Amino acid sequence: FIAQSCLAPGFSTMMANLFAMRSFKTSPDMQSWTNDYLRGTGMEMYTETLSPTFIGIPFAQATELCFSKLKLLLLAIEIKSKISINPRGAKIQANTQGFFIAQSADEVKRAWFYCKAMKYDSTGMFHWSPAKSLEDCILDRNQAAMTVLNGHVVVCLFADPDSPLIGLRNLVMPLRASNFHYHELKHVVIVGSVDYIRREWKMLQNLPKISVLNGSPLSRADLRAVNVNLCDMCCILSAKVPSNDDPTLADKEAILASLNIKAMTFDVYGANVPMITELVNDGNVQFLDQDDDDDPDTELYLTQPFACGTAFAVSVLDSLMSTTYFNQNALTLIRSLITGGATPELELILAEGAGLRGGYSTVESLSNRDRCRVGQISLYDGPLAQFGECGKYGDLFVAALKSYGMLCIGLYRFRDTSASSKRYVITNPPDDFSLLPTDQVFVLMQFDPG
Amino acid sequence: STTYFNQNALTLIRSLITGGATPELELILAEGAGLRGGYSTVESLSNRDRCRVGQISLYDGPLAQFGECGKYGDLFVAALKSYGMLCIGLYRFRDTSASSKRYVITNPPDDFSLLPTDQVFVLMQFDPG
Amino acid sequence: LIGTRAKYGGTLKNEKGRRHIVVCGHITYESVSHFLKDFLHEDREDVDVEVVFLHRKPPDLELEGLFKRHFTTVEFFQGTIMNPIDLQRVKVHEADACLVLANKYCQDPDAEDAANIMRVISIKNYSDDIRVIIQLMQYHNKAYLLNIPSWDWKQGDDVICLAELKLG
Ligand SMILES: [Ca+2]
Ligand SMILES: [Ca+2]
Ligand SMILES: [Mg+2]
């Protein structure tokens, strides 16, 4: 989820809220941005067999009809054995299982009753490298300052040499998927102790564009060396064991790092730097933000930092146990959407113990590069800017689907419409929802060769 | 307790014992690169002119006339006018007769009697050259 | 199971034109008695300033008697500075300043400094425009407090570094 947030900020919040079963009551009058956010939190994954009326039509026309008529968002279908996310030019076959996003399972049933009356690895899903050594990836303060790092990803790691391993692959490899061209790949720099990263370097040898800087991300000198003001996303991860002395002192390391970056000034200030923070305790989210009211008894997803895609914790993942049991395909859609398409026997390759092994690209293998990816767009400029002024969300959804095939999932707009550059996540707004010129849309982008 | 009643009280303490710690020195040190040098200019060299904590003796010197029987007030007045030194206290032997142990007297009265073996806490100015 | 009623609790009663300060951190018999003697001295000019103590563990019988002798000028409350609910009870936003005492005789100076630093963050999170005075054990921890966006020395925020002053 953290890796997906690098490509599109706030995506982790949309992911977490889409598997927690929440019942939403519309409210008469309260805070405006909270009301829009709470309506999105009532959305979750659902599966239903497609009506026979949909047989013989392409997916693009099928999901457009569901949104306009049934007010349902169809984003994935199963073709038989495998799940395709927003397929391009794929017919809707008989007895097809479809994935829908709706408030409740009752609304989903309308879809059933509708009627007229060496470059890549062996699997070819991720980029590959000829096992670059760790010593060649180590950079100094002057080495990192002289090189250009624009649009990169900074991984602030807090880990003792004896700390338990957290698997630094799981954040880098989704950023190294075959969906992205080699020129658009985001550079990854890790700030932390080399002793800990040395144990993690076994599975990072074959991942291109990886940099390691020794030191502590708390120090301002290291942060200025890697140009944190120009990075697309700064990730704060802690691997140290909890001392269990006090629940409020468990995340003292990440809170200090987050506050330190927010106060630094560059010759652009640090308060505008997009950051995501890992929390081992839910109650420490109150210290991540300053201009908000804090309550110990409030739920995590109700907090402002979580609603803005800034805070994240493993406590929101407990809902996956119930979701997996009711439908195995639900978990498969989760992994394919966040891990960059991790094929089954690829884990069998990984379980062997030899690490990531590459393969020669063929015409059959290169076909796997064509799949949808998670992306974010802006309505300020481009050929989709006409809907930013006063166009409805439904109009944007149809226009984007017909022109480029992008499937709009949600919106990412400022908390205050006027001061502060804080954006909250709205999941699947109604077709009559009003847009703003400063809005960002979560979309599923097709793979464009070339 | 002293800091709360007056913030300037703590500022005087830090400047008196640390040799002068300007606020932006803390910001430079907080960066993590350690002490950073700089090229001396005409304005930069002006910061060298400030008072320092020192100790003098009345045994042999131009101020030795007050050691025999001169009062503390006379020594304070004479030192300030001629040299700019500001007497703060005395560092006198415990026994006048023997051990070489000296105790601290802070701001003795102007009628205090001095001794030839007395040391005075003074704040001397910066003398170029 | 029934036990006894909560001896210390509730909210500090508001008074018109009343100045009060909040003291937290190491609240023991040594610190409180020594602090009160220096804070309330005949040599210093008398000012009507209320002293409010906030601590987690209930005070022992010796500290309770000390609070009784200072009933009209010293009050104690049970709670942690990390809880926003407890911050409202002592009315930190209306307090003139917040004082964070430190345990000088601690086994781990890093652990003591980290806990005290987190206290300032909690106080600043509740409201940024609060004067905070903290005792600091080691100098290298001063950088963390300075990097806090809400920390402003011009507004009265001060750090008393024990190591820096002792060696100075
Ligand atoms: Ca729901
Ligand atoms: Ca907050
Ligand atoms: Mg949801």
Side-chain angles (χ1 to χ4, degrees), chain A residues 17-18 40-44:
Chain A
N17 278 331
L18 269 176
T41 61
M43 295 296 172
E44 60 259 12

Side-chain angles (χ1 to χ4, degrees), chain A residues 218 220 246 248-249 252 255-256 259-260 263 286-287 289-290 294-296, chain C residues 56 82-85 111 114-115 117-118 121-122 125 144 146-149:
Chain A
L218 268 169
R220 302 198 153 182
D246 207 37
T248 53
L249 266 70
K252 79 193 175 51
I255 285 162
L256 271 178
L259 290 191
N260 167 45
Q286 54 183 343
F287 310 126
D289 268 12
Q290 286 74 60
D294 299 329
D295 217 356
Chain C
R56 279 192 295 250
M82 304 307 293
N83 199 344
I85 302 305
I117 282 175
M118 277 313 293
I121 292 181
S122 173
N125 169 55
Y144 305 145
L146 292 177
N147 295 343
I148 301 304

Side-chain angles (χ1 to χ4, degrees), chain A residues 12 15 51 91 93 97 141 217 225 238 241 245 312 314 319 367:
Chain A
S12 58
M15 294 299 291
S51 172
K91 299 290 184 180
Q93 294 174 330
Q97 214 74 22
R141 282 220 190 126
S238 181
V241 298
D245 48 350
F312 190 76
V314 295
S319 59
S367 66

Side-chain angles (χ1 to χ4, degrees), chain A residues 201-213:
Chain A
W201 196 252
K202 182 179 176 201
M203 296 300 291
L204 298 161
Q205 288 159 347
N206 304 112
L207 292 176
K209 307 173 82 166
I210 289 192
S211 314
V212 171
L213 167 69

Side-chain angles (χ1 to χ4, degrees), chain B residues 1-11 13-19 21-23 25-32, chain C residues 19 21 35 38-39 44 47 49 96-97 99 131 133 139 142-143 146-147 153-160 164-165 168:
Chain B
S1 315
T2 302
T3 307
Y4 160 73
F5 283 113
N6 197 0
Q7 183 187 14
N8 289 339
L10 181 63
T11 305
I13 299 168
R14 285 176 32 86
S15 71
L16 199 41
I17 77 168
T18 62
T22 55
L25 188 60
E26 297 267 41
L27 282 72
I28 289 166
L29 288 188
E31 293 275 322
Chain C
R19 283 174 51 198
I21 64 170
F35 172 80
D38 201 278
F39 195 82
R44 231 193 282 275
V47 292
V49 175
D96 284 9
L99 272 71
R131 189 184 176 201
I133 310 157
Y139 190 85
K142 207 171 188 164
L146 292 177
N147 295 343
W153 171 77
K154 293 182 184 292
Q155 299 296 324
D157 295 356
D158 283 299
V159 170
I160 291 154
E164 168 191 47
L165 294 158

